[PDB]
Scaffold this active site. Structure first.
Site, PDB file in Angstrom:
ATOM      1  N   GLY C  10      59.227 -17.684  17.235  1.00 19.67           N
ATOM      2  CA  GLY C  10      59.289 -17.508  18.671  1.00 19.67           C
ATOM      3  C   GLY C  10      57.925 -17.610  19.322  1.00 19.67           C
ATOM      4  CD  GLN C  11      55.921 -17.531  25.225  1.00 20.31           C
ATOM      5  OE1 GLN C  11      55.417 -16.675  25.948  1.00 20.31           O
ATOM      6  NE2 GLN C  11      56.697 -18.495  25.695  1.00 20.31           N
ATOM      7  CB  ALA C  99      67.522 -17.773  21.536  1.00 17.50           C
ATOM      8  N   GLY C 143      62.532 -11.469  22.662  1.00 17.14           N
ATOM      9  CA  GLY C 143      62.980 -12.844  22.749  1.00 17.14           C
ATOM     10  C   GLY C 143      64.242 -13.084  21.943  1.00 17.14           C
ATOM     11  N   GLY C 146      62.715 -14.614  18.607  1.00 19.54           N
ATOM     12  CA  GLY C 146      62.038 -13.543  17.894  1.00 19.54           C
ATOM     13  C   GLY C 146      62.997 -12.524  17.313  1.00 19.54           C
ATOM     14  CE1 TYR C 224      52.952 -11.991  27.032  1.00 19.64           C
ATOM     15  CE2 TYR C 224      53.494 -14.132  27.959  1.00 19.64           C
ATOM     16  CZ  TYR C 224      53.841 -12.826  27.679  1.00 19.64           C
ATOM     17  OH  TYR C 224      55.081 -12.353  28.043  1.00 19.64           O
ATOM     18  CG  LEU C 252      52.331  -8.924   0.800  1.00 22.89           C
ATOM     19  CD1 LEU C 252      53.445  -9.894   1.161  1.00 22.89           C
ATOM     20  CD2 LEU C 252      51.542  -8.520   2.037  1.00 22.89           C
ATOM     21  CD  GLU C 254      47.061  -1.145  -3.389  1.00 22.04           C
ATOM     22  OE1 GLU C 254      46.978  -2.266  -3.940  1.00 22.04           O
ATOM     23  OE2 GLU C 254      46.125  -0.307  -3.390  1.00 22.04           O
TER      24      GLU C 254
HETATM   25  N1  LIG Z   1      51.777  -9.640  22.929  1.00 19.58           N
HETATM   26  C1  LIG Z   1      52.458 -10.746  23.213  1.00 19.58           C
HETATM   27  N2  LIG Z   1      53.764 -10.647  23.631  1.00 19.58           N
HETATM   28  C2  LIG Z   1      54.462 -11.765  23.919  1.00 19.58           C
HETATM   29  C3  LIG Z   1      53.884 -13.022  23.803  1.00 19.58           C
HETATM   30  N3  LIG Z   1      54.812 -13.936  24.155  1.00 19.58           N
HETATM   31  C4  LIG Z   1      55.952 -13.286  24.489  1.00 19.58           C
HETATM   32  N4  LIG Z   1      55.742 -11.940  24.358  1.00 19.58           N
HETATM   33  C5  LIG Z   1      56.704 -10.851  24.584  1.00 19.58           C
HETATM   34  O1  LIG Z   1      57.882 -11.179  23.876  1.00 19.58           O
HETATM   35  C6  LIG Z   1      59.028 -10.877  24.643  1.00 19.58           C
HETATM   36  C7  LIG Z   1      59.816 -12.158  24.878  1.00 19.58           C
HETATM   37  O2  LIG Z   1      60.010 -12.788  23.635  1.00 19.58           O
HETATM   38  P1  LIG Z   1      59.533 -14.293  23.309  1.00 19.58           P
HETATM   39  O3  LIG Z   1      58.748 -14.333  22.019  1.00 19.58           O
HETATM   40  O4  LIG Z   1      58.739 -14.865  24.455  1.00 19.58           O
HETATM   41  O5  LIG Z   1      60.945 -15.072  23.181  1.00 19.58           O
HETATM   42  P2  LIG Z   1      61.292 -16.107  21.995  1.00 19.58           P
HETATM   43  O6  LIG Z   1      61.062 -15.497  20.630  1.00 19.58           O
HETATM   44  O7  LIG Z   1      60.494 -17.374  22.174  1.00 19.58           O
HETATM   45  O8  LIG Z   1      62.874 -16.411  22.130  1.00 19.58           O
HETATM   46  P3  LIG Z   1      63.542 -17.349  23.269  1.00 19.58           P
HETATM   47  O9  LIG Z   1      62.495 -17.809  24.258  1.00 19.58           O
HETATM   48  O10 LIG Z   1      64.615 -16.562  23.973  1.00 19.58           O
HETATM   49  O11 LIG Z   1      64.165 -18.536  22.577  1.00 19.58           O
HETATM   50  C8  LIG Z   1      58.545 -10.273  25.945  1.00 19.58           C
HETATM   51  O12 LIG Z   1      58.593  -8.873  25.802  1.00 19.58           O
HETATM   52  C9  LIG Z   1      57.107 -10.724  26.042  1.00 19.58           C
HETATM   53  O13 LIG Z   1      56.328  -9.769  26.718  1.00 19.58           O
HETATM   54  C10 LIG Z   1      52.569 -13.131  23.379  1.00 19.58           C
HETATM   55  O14 LIG Z   1      52.034 -14.237  23.266  1.00 19.58           O
HETATM   56  N5  LIG Z   1      51.864 -11.984  23.086  1.00 19.58           N
HETATM   57 MG   LIG Z   2      60.781 -18.902  23.734  1.00 19.25          MG
END
Ligand SMILES: Nc1nc2c(ncn2[C@@H]2O[C@H](COP(=O)(O)OP(=O)(O)OP(=O)(O)O)[C@@H](O)[C@H]2O)c(=O)[nH]1
Ligand SMILES: [Mg+2]
Ligand SMILES: Nc1ncnc2c1ncn2[C@@H]1O[C@H](COP(=O)(O)OP(=O)(O)CP(=O)(O)O)[C@@H](O)[C@H]1O
Ligand SMILES: Nc1nc2c(ncn2[C@@H]2O[C@H](COP(=O)(O)OP(=O)(O)O)[C@@H](O)[C@H]2O)c(=O)[nH]1
Ligand SMILES: [Ca+2]
Ligand SMILES: [Ca+2]
Ligand SMILES: [Ca+2]
Ligand SMILES: [Mg+2]
Ligand SMILES: [Mg+2]
EC number: 3.6.5.-
Lengths: 352, 424, 437, 54
Positions: C10-11, C99, C143, C146, C224, C252, C254
């Site tokens: 995920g992002q 997603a 996400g 995620g 971010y 890991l 440990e």
């Molecule tokens: N600390 C941090 N949080 C992040 C970042 N990117 C997204 N988030 C957090 O992650 C949550 C959203 O999930 P994402 O990871 O963006 O979503 P994804 O896993 O890409 O899933 P989808 O976009 O729905 O397909 C939110 O609470 C955001 O604040 C990042 O680069 N750093």
């Molecule tokens: Mg995403």
């Protein structure tokens, strides 16, 4: 426009604080489950501290100190005093006490008996009292057997502490009493003693040769208004206020309330609150706390002050609700959420 | 690339759609001939969401123009940006719909719908990953209302897993063409309750009151009302046309905004609305106006209901810290109008590129239960005539039975009830 | 030498992973092109850093990392960024559409269609391993990818690699930087299905990182990038023992032994200090006692809670820079007498300490100031249960009205999975209460 | 206050300080889950198409 919620409907003190906040026209009450609040007048049991301080852009304040129960619980107080170096086991202003668990369940049974046998052998006054937090159920006895058997009949933890056989008796009446002090601790952990206290006096003459009748020994405002037959005789409602109690000490004992009693009270309040400060301070926390405490003291005939207990959810004397509740709003709430003297509090300075 | 296919149906739909492509074409630096002449790479970042790229670096809007009479689209073709539209994307008949929902949905419209789908299919096939569809139309006429909802039903049959979004102009007696508008709107609303994921309710009454009272326009024209619609459509689609994390695509928007499938009708709002026009507008001022009923395009008082979800978009170079402060100041100072069983239901987004001729603006998108007021007005005007069967012969003459009206009536009254229960 | 494979989902996972490998390269003296001059064994070797980097005949040091996102815009940052050369195409996996912040959409709908491709790319990395330890999985709770795809991935990894350890770095949802109202649904859904498959998980609350960035770094509105650079420092502190010579947490396994006596209670609280602004005139270098005492200030924890009202089951101190055991024991003694550090009666009241002499590396032009010494405390407090309580409560408010549930059912998930997941969290909250109260 | 298990290398050292002594689903079962969800999705879409066909 500040917002607050109410989660303890049975609190007379904060019922008046809620009423006062609205009167300012600058505070708005929300439903008890609305998380977007500046102030929480929380419940007594299981207040959800873990949910405070997580609303973006909301400085949140609660009227209880998480962890302060260590001080306001019968057995907890004894354990805190005996184990904390600041207070030590030799603490001279707290009656000798022991935590006793009923046998149907650490425990200090044998350590109490050792001290008890010593007094019995030494011809000294060996009268003790048994009580707990699950009471209105108190027993005053001079025989260790009756005390232990009384705790076993129950099912909750009890504490046996020495009974002050030489209380200071007001005259006329030859009657016992206790002193209630209200102490406010703000978000910065400044300790504020309400200038006004109350003596919850017994209307029945103190009888040292009969601990069975618990009307002249227990000075609770409920036991004196239910089982006492001279209720309201000497003072309105068995409540003597500082102005009268002070003049009495001057006429009878040639001393003042400040020198003879208040110095020791202020010392005890500081010791107790300063002890737990590192454990309960919210200085560097995501939410802030304040809390109103009720300290209960006993005075023996030598003018020595003793600490009986500390109440975390105390009620107030009817005559003092208005002034006190206004004081809570002034120094506890508005000090954090200002609004668009001659303070009623005595600030007890200390090192942080 | 995640493309959106745009459809505009009927007179209202094509006039409002025309201004929409006019406004965003300007924002993305596209000129009336489809040639890019902007000065920022942010303009081409998401350009393919609404534009196809042809030979010679030409950007052709992914837009399908539909009508049952040629009048309005002939205007669009001769309009300012008329040259930019793909000539193959004009689909029109000659009979017209006579402001008749039955004609658009069952007779005249049925005869033309397959040729519209052919163009939709052609546009979809050239999509890397089609997000879904957006449709502009009114609900008080015949083509946009009747054939518009027929298109949605058939688009859903062929693309059941794509997002269906509409900008739907609701009729008002203050800006009315015919007395049968409540009939056409009530029949359409049931279609939208079933077959759209998001519907921006654009109330002509609210657009009128704004032009008369706020904008101080003595006699508002359809062009004046459309200026507000063009601006509103640009705001709500900003998150889709420029990079960002919040409500970036249609499905994510729907997930954040729609807690229950049938309650997907949004109240949009815009700020500023200025008639003293060079003054800079501060963030506190944008936020106050954006939440003020007088800035709502749905002619509903939010203080009569509760917000299920709120999306806010701020455009321009401003204090992003001061944005969070003011947004959090509106919620914490009026939380009685936000449901407490959806935590953190107010989302905010910021875009650097402001609208043409504005240092900064704010667009409001609310899923408020106060929208039931809009469906109540329509229902009452519908019942006032239907109880006497007035004007029904225009519809029975096209094959419809009174039963279908009775069921539309119940369906919209159920919708009002569902809104009422979540407000309590 | 045993290899560790990093998986970024995920992002949040991909952008945090990108920041970590940037820092890893600076820490090990690896250049963007993948060349490591100080490495004398060309195209081979079993040094400590080789647990995270393989080597090609051309002397390129390649991260043992897999990046997975259901939508390509984020992973395209890696393909065209500063360290594009480090990775090869097979490691960067992207789909067409995401997603939509929908757990069910990432776990079921889309997850079912890409899971086998992801295992294949991971297998290609495992085949290069003479002794794989397990996996490090970076992802968000909120996400749809995620949460959704990660939990599916963790199930399959338990099947295809039953004897390997799996550690998580998980981003707890915070409304100040959140983009979805349903993130509480996704958080609990993914924690339920992942619990039995994760050995040790380090939760990072974006709320904590956000405030640290505003308070200590003077970033008025952190981005971010600001968050991930701070997060990568903490992650680097945690994984340093795997990448450098040492004796504490060298594999890991440990981590679980030293931090997780009860398998379900495997969420150690992380605290880091110091965090000093780079724009500051010039900060006074904090001492071992000061940065150590800072490890008990709630303002420096990765999750905002109050350890004073919990109990510790384990506690690790990971120092980097100018630190000597003498000064550590001195500070520890001073802190026991000043702090409320209550252990469970069935766990020894002790601290495991690790010292890496190399001070914290900071990215040039970043927001963090160079400091001579720093520490990251990993402690397993029952106090972190506060984060579950908060999250479970938000879940309860929405689920009582079934708000947004139709989005999940519409993707094939049964509504019962909601209550099944929520009941598991209720049991998790009870386990914390039985241990620390 | 006791120190144990001290280990020193060029790049650092580690040790332990004691302050007080004490007092899965198979690959098949995963495919079923994924296919049951896909079946409910197929079923729901068939109901929509049936509704549209009516
Ligand atoms: N600390 C941090 N949080 C992040 C970042 N990117 C997204 N988030 C957090 O992650 C949550 C959203 O999930 P994402 O990871 O963006 O979503 P994804 O896993 O890409 O899933 P989808 O976009 O729905 O397909 C939110 O609470 C955001 O604040 C990042 O680069 N750093
Ligand atoms: Mg995403
Ligand atoms: N050790 C002791 N020696 C003498 N008297 C004692 C005593 N402990 C309690 N008492 C008597 O009991 C009364 C207080 O009882 P206690 O405070 O333990 O019960 P309680 O907590 O239910 C009343 P409160 O409302 O103040 O909390 C006092 O009036 C005092 O006279
Ligand atoms: N805001 C706005 N409303 C319009 C416009 N044209 C028509 N309407 C409204 O739309 C309804 C008439 O529908 P119309 O689009 O003209 O019929 P159609 O061509 O059959 O779809 C009435 O409620 C009109 O008030 C327009 O340009 N702008
Ligand atoms: Ca015909
Ligand atoms: Ca080598
Ligand atoms: Ca396992
Ligand atoms: Mg009491
Ligand atoms: Mg018309």
């Amino acid at each position: 426009m500040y917002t607050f919620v109410v989660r303890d409907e049975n609190s007379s003190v904060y019922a008046e604080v809620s009423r006062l906040l609205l009167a300012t026209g600058q505070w708005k009450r929300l439903r008890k489950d609305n998380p977007r609040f500046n102030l929480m007048l929380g419940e007594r049991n299981r207040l959800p501290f873990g949910r405070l301080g997580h609303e973006p852009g909301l400085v949140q304040l609660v009227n209880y100190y998480r962890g302060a129960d260590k001080l306001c619980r019968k057995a907890s107080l004894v354990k805190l005093i005996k184990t904390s170096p600041e207070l030590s086991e030799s603490c001279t202003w707290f009656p000798e006490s022991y935590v006793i668990y009923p046998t149907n369940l650490t425990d200090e049974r044998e350590v109490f008996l050792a001290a008890y046998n010593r007094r019995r052998e030494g011809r000294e006054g060996n009268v003790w009292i048994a009580k707990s937090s699950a009471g209105a159920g108190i027993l005053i006895s001079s025989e260790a057997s009756e005390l232990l058997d009384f705790i076993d009949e129950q099912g909750q933890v009890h504490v046996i502490q020495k009974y002050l056989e030489k209380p200071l008796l007001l005259e006329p009446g030859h009657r016992k009493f206790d002193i209630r002090s209200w102490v406010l601790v703000d978000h910065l952990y400044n300790i504020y003693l309400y200038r006004e206290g109350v003596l919850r006096t017994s209307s029945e003459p103190y009888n040292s040769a009969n601990f069975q009748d618990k009307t002249c020994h227990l000075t609770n405002h409920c036991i004196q208004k239910e089982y006492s037959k001279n209720y309201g005789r000497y003072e309105e409602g068995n409540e003597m206020f500082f102005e009268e109690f002070n003049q009495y000490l001057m006429d009878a004992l040639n001393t003042t309330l400040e020198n003879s009693i208040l110095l020791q009270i202020k010392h005890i309040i500081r010791s107790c609150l300063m002890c737990i400060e590192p454990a309960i301070s919210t200085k560097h926390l995501h939410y802030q706390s304040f809390q109103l405490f009720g300290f209960d003291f006993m005075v023996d005939e030598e003018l020595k002050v003793w600490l009986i207990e500390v109440n975390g959810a105390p009620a107030c004397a009817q005559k003092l609700y208005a002034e006190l509740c206004q004081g809570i709003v002034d120094v506890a709430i508005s000090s954090v959420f200002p609004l668009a003297p001659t303070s009623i509090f005595i600030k007890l300075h200390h090192h942080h | 690339m995640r493309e959106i296919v745009h459809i505009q149906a009927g007179q209202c739909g094509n006039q409002i759609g025309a201004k929409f492509w006019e406004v965003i074409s300007d924002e993305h630096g596209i000129d009336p001939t489809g040639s890019y002449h902007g000065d920022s790479d942010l303009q081409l970042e998401r350009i393919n969401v609404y534009y196809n790229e042809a030979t010679g670096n030409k950007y052709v809007p992914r837009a399908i123009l539909v009508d049952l009479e040629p009048g309005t689209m002939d205007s669009v073709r001769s309009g300012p940006f008329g040259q930019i539209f793909r000539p193959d994307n004009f689909v029109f008949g000659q009979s017209g719909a006579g402001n008749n929902w039955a004609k658009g949905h069952y007779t005249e419209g049925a005869e033309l719908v397959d040729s519209v789908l052919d163009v939709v299919r052609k546009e979809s096939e050239s999509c890397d990953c089609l997000q879904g569809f957006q449709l502009t139309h009114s609900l008080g006429g015949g083509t946009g209302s009747g054939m518009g909802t027929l298109l949605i039903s058939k688009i859903r049959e062929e693309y059941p897993d794509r997002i269906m979004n509409t900008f739907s102009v609701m009729p008002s007696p203050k800006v009315s063409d015919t007395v049968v508008e409540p009939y056409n709107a009530t029949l359409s609303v049931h279609q939208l309750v079933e077959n759209t994921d998001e519907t921006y309710c654009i109330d002509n009454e609210a657009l009128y009151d704004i032009c008369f009272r706020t904008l101080k326009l003595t006699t508002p024209t359809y062009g004046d009302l459309n200026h507000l619609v063009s601006a509103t459509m640009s705001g709500v689609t900003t998150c889709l046309r420029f990079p960002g994390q919040l409500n970036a695509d249609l499905r994510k928007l729907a997930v954040n905004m729609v807690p229950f499938p049938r309650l997907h009708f949004f109240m949009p709002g815009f700020a500023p609305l200025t008639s003293q026009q060079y003054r800079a507008l501060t963030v506190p001022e944008l936020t106050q106006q954006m939440f003020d009923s007088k800035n709502m395009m749905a002619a509903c008082d939010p203080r009569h209901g509760r917000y299920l979800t709120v999306a806010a978009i701020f455009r321009g170079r401003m204090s992003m810290k001061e944005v969070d402060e003011q947004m959090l100041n509106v919620q914490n100072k009026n939380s009685s109008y936000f449901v407490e069983w959806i935590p953190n239901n107010v989302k905010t987004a910021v875009c650097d590129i402001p609208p043409r001729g504005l240092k900064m603006s704010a667009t409001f998108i609310g899923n408020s239960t106060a929208i039931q007021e809009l469906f109540k007005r329509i229902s009452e005007q519908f019942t006032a005539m239907f109880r006497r069967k007035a004007f029904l012969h225009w519809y029975t003459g096209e094959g419809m039975d009174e039963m279908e009206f009775t069921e539309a009536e119940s369906n919209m009254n159920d919708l009002v009830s569902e809104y009422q229960q979540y407000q309590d | 030498m045993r290899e560790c494979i990093s998986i970024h989902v995920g992002q949040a996972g991909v952008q945090i992973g990108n920041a970590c490998w940037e820092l890893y390269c600076l820490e090990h003296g690896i250049q963007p092109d993948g060349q490591m001059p100080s490495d004398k064994t060309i195209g081979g070797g079993d040094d400590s850093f080789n647990t995270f980097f393989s080597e090609t005949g051309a002397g390129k040091h390649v991260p043992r990392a897999v990046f997975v996102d259901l939508e390509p815009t984020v992973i395209d940052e890696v393909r065209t960024g500063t360290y594009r050369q480090l990775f090869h195409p097979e490691q960067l996996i992207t789909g067409k559409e995401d997603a939509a912040n929908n757990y069910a959409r990432g776990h079921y709908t889309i997850g079912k269609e890409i899971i086998d491709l992801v295992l294949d790319r991971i297998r290609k990395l495992a085949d290069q391993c003479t002794g794989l330890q397990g996996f490090l999985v970076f992802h968000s709770f909120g996400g749809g990818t995620g949460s959704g795809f990660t939990s599916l991935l963790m199930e399959r990894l338990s099947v295809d690699y039953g004897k390997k350890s799996k550690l998580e770095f998980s981003i707890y949802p915070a409304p100040q930087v959140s983009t979805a109202v349903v993130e509480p649904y996704n958080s609990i859904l993914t924690t339920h299905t992942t619990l039995e498959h994760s050995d040790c998980a380090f939760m990072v609350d974006n709320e904590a990182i956000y405030d640290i960035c505003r308070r200590n770094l003077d970033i008025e509105r952190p981005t971010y990038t600001n968050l991930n650079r701070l997060i990568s420092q903490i992650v680097s502190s945690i994984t340093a023992s795997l990448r450098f010579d040492g004796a504490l947490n060298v594999d890991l396994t440990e981590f679980q032994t030293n931090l997780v006596p009860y398998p379900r209670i495997h969420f150690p609280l992380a605290t880091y200090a110091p965090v000093i602004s780079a724009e500051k005139a010039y900060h006074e270098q904090l001492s071992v006692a000061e940065i150590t005492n800072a490890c008990f200030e709630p303002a420096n924890q990765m999750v905002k809670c109050d350890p004073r009202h919990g109990k510790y089951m384990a506690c690790c101190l990971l120092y980097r820079g100018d630190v000597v055991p003498k000064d550590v024991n001195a500070a520890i003694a001073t802190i026991k007498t000043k702090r409320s550090i209550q252990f469970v009666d069935w766990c020894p009241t002790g601290f495991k300490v690790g010292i890496n002499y190399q001070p914290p590396t900071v990215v040039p032009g970043g927001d963090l100031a160079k400091v001579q010494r720093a520490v990251c405390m990993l402690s397993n407090t029952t106090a972190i249960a506060e984060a579950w309580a908060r999250l479970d409560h938000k879940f309860d408010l929405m689920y009582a009205k079934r708000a947004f549930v139709h989005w999940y059912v519409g993707e094939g998930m049964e509504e019962g999975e909601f209550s099944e997941a929520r009941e598991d969290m209720a049991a998790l909250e009870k386990d914390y209460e039985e241990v620390g109260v | 206050m006791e120190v144990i298990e001290l280990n020193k290398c060029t790049s650092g050292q580690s040790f332990e300080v004691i302050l007080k002594p004490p007092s899965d689903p198979s690959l098949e079962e995963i495919q079923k889950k994924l296919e049951a969800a896909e079946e409910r999705r197929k079923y729901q879409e068939a109901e929509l198409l049936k509704h549209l066909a009516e």
